[PDB]
Amino acid sequence: EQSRLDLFIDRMVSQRACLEHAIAQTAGLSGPVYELGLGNGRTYHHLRQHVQGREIYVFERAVASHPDSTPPEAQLILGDIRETLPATLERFGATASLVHADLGGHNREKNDRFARLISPLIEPHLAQGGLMVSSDRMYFEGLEELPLPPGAVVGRCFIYRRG
Amino acid sequence: EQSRLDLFIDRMVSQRACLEHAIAQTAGLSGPVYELGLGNGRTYHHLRQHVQGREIYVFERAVASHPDSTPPEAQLILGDIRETLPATLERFGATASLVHADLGHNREKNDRFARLISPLIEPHLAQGGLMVSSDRMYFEGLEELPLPPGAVVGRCFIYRR
Ligand SMILES: C[S@@+](CC[C@H](N)C(=O)[O-])C[C@H]1O[C@@H](n2cnc3c(N)ncnc32)[C@H](O)[C@@H]1O
Ligand code: NI
Ligand code: NI
């Protein structure tokens, strides 16, 4: 049995491990990193520190980030990702190197329904060799699930790749 | 070079390690556990899974936690702690086994607040009672204990009556 504190710690530790791994594994790609969900902005802040030589675009419906974790307007894609993902695909095509999602709220069942719904909206964005890291199990057609790196906790984050 | 994600992992890992150790060290005491600040209720949810044979009272200004991490009405002490700690002292006396606080990252404000609440908290502790905090505290007669394995020095603190 795990508390909500144990789960939150395991989530953050897994994000850090999975994102650092995913950045390294995609360092030969030059397309952007997509951050789905800004929130307080901790993973965005982490990405800004660890991503070199790629842009980071942030998808968010309402910006309320800690001030030092706020994306510049040019890299903010504002609105509901159910509309903005398809709009962005027309703009940038299948060029993303890394897509990170931490879109979940407090209700795990709602989170899983949303993961199901958004999976086919995310999949077309990835370049060949691109990775997708999520704090929800995803429902992709073509992306292969990868084994987790050291430090990650099974069931907290999931990693997928466009082969 | 630590990011905000690195810092918050260290905060939460240290809080958990300190709290679990503190709960165990005070498991022989029958007086209640006081949680100062509910917030989203993750820490309260943790306390519920680990504290045995004692009540948990939560001090909060206004409840904003999901139902799954909200204490029962009877264990919620609502209002500004400058008032509610002294009011609680008249009600329950120096019987608390464990008092826990996370402050929330600005050095000077936190420190002034730690100085403000230290003398409010101190009289509540029963003999053998512990106080666990995210920030350095300023007690008259409580001794600082070593950190347990897993806690990051400077990110959490433990004191004892
Ligand atoms: C858990 S918070 C993100 C926390 C972040 N990863 C961090 O480390 O601080 C989830 C965020 O996703 C956003 N979000 C959820 N559904 C969305 C949607 N359909 N479109 C755009 N943003 C959404 C929320 O508004 C919220 O800011
Ligand atoms: Ni299908
Ligand atoms: Ni399918």
Side-chain angles (χ1 to χ4, degrees), chain A residues 1-10 12-89 91-107 109-163, chain B residues 1-89 91-106 108-111 113-161:
Chain A
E1 182 179 318
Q2 278 196 122
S3 81
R4 299 183 53 232
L5 182 55
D6 294 314
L7 291 166
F8 180 60
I9 287 169
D10 284 354
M12 285 190 298
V13 167
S14 302
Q15 288 170 329
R16 172 172 70 184
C18 288
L19 290 172
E20 287 180 16
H21 177 63
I23 292 161
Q25 287 286 306
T26 57
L29 302 179
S30 64
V33 176
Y34 292 170
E35 170 74 348
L36 307 184
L38 180 59
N40 183 269
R42 298 190 177 86
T43 49
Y44 174 62
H45 192 267
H46 200 77
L47 290 171
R48 293 186 51 99
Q49 186 165 315
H50 288 263
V51 172
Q52 311 302 333
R54 285 180 270 177
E55 307 198 294
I56 304 159
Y57 291 82
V58 175
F59 293 69
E60 174 57 65
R61 68 193 156 190
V63 169
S65 42
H66 191 248
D68 65 7
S69 310
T70 306
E73 191 71 25
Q75 276 78 54
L76 174 63
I77 296 169
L78 183 76
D80 192 308
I81 62 173
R82 292 164 299 176
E83 286 77 57
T84 69
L85 280 169
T88 302
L89 193 67
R91 185 185 172 195
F92 292 151
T95 57
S97 59
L98 172 56
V99 177
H100 174 235
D102 184 31
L103 293 150
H106 191 102
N107 186 316
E109 297 64 44
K110 290 190 176 174
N111 295 346
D112 172 67
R113 294 189 289 272
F114 191 65
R116 181 185 298 268
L117 184 156
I118 64 178
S119 287
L121 302 182
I122 293 167
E123 187 158 9
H125 289 265
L126 284 187
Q128 293 180 47
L131 298 179
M132 200 281 152
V133 175
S134 189
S135 45
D136 297 295
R137 186 182 300 271
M138 304 301 278
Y139 296 83
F140 293 123
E141 288 288 352
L143 309 182
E144 62 181 320
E145 189 177 358
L146 302 186
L148 294 175
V153 174
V154 174
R156 297 282 70 73
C157 292
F158 298 83
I159 307 172
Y160 308 85
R161 179 168 66 196
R162 186 178 167 190
Chain B
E1 176 205 32
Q2 285 202 297
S3 80
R4 289 186 67 242
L5 188 55
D6 296 315
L7 288 164
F8 209 54
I9 286 162
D10 284 355
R11 179 189 296 261
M12 297 300 101
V13 169
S14 306
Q15 180 191 115
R16 180 180 58 183
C18 288
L19 281 173
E20 296 186 3
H21 182 261
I23 289 166
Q25 188 157 356
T26 57
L29 301 180
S30 65
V33 179
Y34 297 168
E35 166 68 348
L36 306 185
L38 181 53
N40 54 211
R42 287 194 185 99
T43 298
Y44 176 67
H45 193 266
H46 200 73
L47 289 173
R48 288 289 295 262
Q49 298 199 349
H50 291 274
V51 179
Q52 301 170 294
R54 293 176 273 175
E55 301 266 12
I56 300 163
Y57 289 83
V58 177
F59 292 72
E60 182 47 63
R61 282 255 190 71
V63 187
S65 59
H66 184 286
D68 71 4
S69 313
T70 310
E73 184 283 307
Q75 275 67 57
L76 206 44
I77 297 175
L78 296 179
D80 193 302
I81 48 173
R82 289 172 288 187
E83 176 191 302
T84 64
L85 272 170
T88 299
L89 191 68
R91 183 185 174 199
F92 291 149
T95 51
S97 60
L98 177 56
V99 178
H100 169 253
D102 183 278
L103 272 41
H105 69 86
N106 159 194
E108 191 270 11
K109 277 179 209 172
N110 285 8
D111 191 67
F113 189 61
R115 289 170 179 283
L116 179 71
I117 69 176
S118 290
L120 299 177
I121 290 164
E122 189 161 7
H124 292 258
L125 286 178
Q127 173 60 216
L130 300 198
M131 197 281 142
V132 173
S133 183
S134 64
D135 290 74
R136 182 173 314 284
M137 309 293 285
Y138 294 89
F139 295 118
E140 299 301 305
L142 303 189
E143 73 199 58
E144 190 178 351
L145 302 192
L147 287 182
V152 179
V153 191
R155 301 312 310 279
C156 204
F157 300 78
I158 305 173
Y159 303 86
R160 156 181 274 257
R161 189 192 157 179

